[PDB]
Design a protein around this ligand. Structure first.
Ligand SMILES: [Ca+2]
Ligand SMILES: [Ca+2]
Ligand SMILES: [Ca+2]
Ligand SMILES: [Ca+2]
Ligand SMILES: [Ca+2]
Length: 395
């Protein structure tokens, strides 16, 4: 059957405000592991290893993400941890993975402005998400030319994302008329609705960087207040997709937008097979979306790197993972010298049944910019972990 076992770590929020988003990632990672095990496992030095896993609950709590990371690295001695969602959770974890010279694989869309030697990324950087989204909302949406109002959670991802949006929209000649943050999990949206009505009396663009289940209150409250597509108000969201939409109800999201690398509505054999397999394993009701596709790819990229390294030692796997390619559900993906993923970019409008109608797509994959080329501190910097004269951040 198999010669031996390897145990990997899985670390995600199964409780608290982020469980709405992260719970389905554990199921997707498990599906990649079960597919790999059914195909014969991972081959190292002529021997077939079964992939086993340990799942730790990060509990929507950043200090918990750091403590569970110490446990998986030092107690369980896993060769990789698949995990994280919030940039807060990842920033709390980063010093653990760096100080122990370990390996986190992180799948979620984020702000960039980071290039850890101890982290690989499958989530969009801003040039693979928010930069094309900003341009599409300002030039092509029904609110083209109108001002932007920024709403997000009070932590590093939304604050950094919105800094980049402000520089970009300034360069396009657009205007920001509002920027408000809610504490993560906070459901009191009424004061921000009053600010939107005063700043955008004739409709416009709302950039949503809310993370986790406060999104439920946000979409329900804005609709009840008449901040709707029919009244000329369009939301572009970066941190929810088909799974969360299924929990909230598509009646609340129809006509709003998203920007992702994978969407369940991609009409390819690879996309249809991923969605069919997920539903066959976990139920007909179950969606797939970008966060899940990102998490799925992590497990297959890791497995391809191990087989090329002929080692589970993360020191060697991290070296060899740069340049690994995969025929993913979204299309072809490639791990770059900056530890991020070249990915295809899609703009979608949410339909009555909670799918994206794909309106804009790149002809092929876009190279990720870890260091943002709109933000003044990062302009002209890159990351390249393959060259000792380059590293984390060089001109
Ligand atoms: Ca739960
Ligand atoms: Ca190590
Ligand atoms: Ca991705
Ligand atoms: Ca309508
Ligand atoms: Ca870069």
């Amino acid at each position: 059957d198999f010669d031996d076992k390897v145990t990997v770590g899985i670390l995600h929020s199964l409780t608290g405000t982020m469980a709405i988003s992260e719970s389905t990632l554990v199921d997707t990672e498990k599906m990649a592991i079960d597919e790999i095990n059914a195909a014969g496992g991972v081959e190292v030095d002529g021997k077939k290893y079964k992939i086993e896993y340990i799942v730790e609950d990060g509990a929507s709590d950043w200090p918990t993400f750091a403590e569970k990371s110490k446990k998986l690295i030092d107690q369980d001695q896993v060769p990789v941890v698949f995990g994280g969602w919030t940039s807060a959770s990842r920033k709390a974890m980063l010093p653990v993975y760096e100080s122990k010279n370990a390996f986190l694989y992180y799948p979620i869309q984020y702000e960039g402005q980071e290039c850890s030697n101890n982290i690989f990324y499958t989530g969009a950087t801003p040039n693979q998400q928010s930069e094309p989204a900003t341009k599409f909302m300002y030039e092509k949406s029904p609110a083209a030319g109108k001002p932007f109002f920024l709403v997000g959670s009070d932590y590093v991802f939304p604050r950094t994302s919105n800094t980049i949006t402000k520089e970009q929209l300034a360069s396009l000649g657009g205007e920001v008329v509002g920027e408000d943050y809610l504490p993560l999990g906070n459901t009191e949206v009424a004061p921000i609705i009053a600010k939107i009505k005063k700043a955008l009396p004739d409709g416009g663009v709302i950039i949503n960087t809310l993370n986790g289940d406060q999104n439920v209150a946000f979409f329900k409250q804005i609709q009840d207040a008449g901040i709707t597509p029919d009244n000329g108000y369009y939301v572009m969201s970066y941190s929810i997709a088909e799974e969360e939409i299924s929990t909230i109800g598509s009646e609340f999201l129809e006509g709003h937008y998203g920007a992702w690398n994978y969407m369940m509505s991609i009409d390819t054999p690879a996309s249809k097979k991923f969605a069919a397999d997920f539903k066959a394993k976990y139920g007909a009701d179950r969606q797939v979306a970008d966060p899940q596709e990102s998490a799925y790819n992590m497990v297959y990229l890791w497995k391809k790197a191990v087989e090329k390294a002929n080692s589970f030692d993360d020191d060697k796997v991290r070296e060899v993972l740069v340049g690994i390619e995969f025929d993913a559900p979204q299309g072809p993906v490639k791990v770059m010298p900056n530890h991020h993923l070249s990915q295809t970019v899609r703009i979608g409008q949410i339909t009555a049944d909670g799918q994206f109608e794909i309106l804009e797509s790149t002809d092929g994959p876009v190279a990720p910019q870890a260091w943002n080329q709109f933000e003044p501190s990062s302009k002209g910097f890159a990351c390249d972990w393959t060259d000792a004269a380059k590293g984390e951040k060089y001109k």
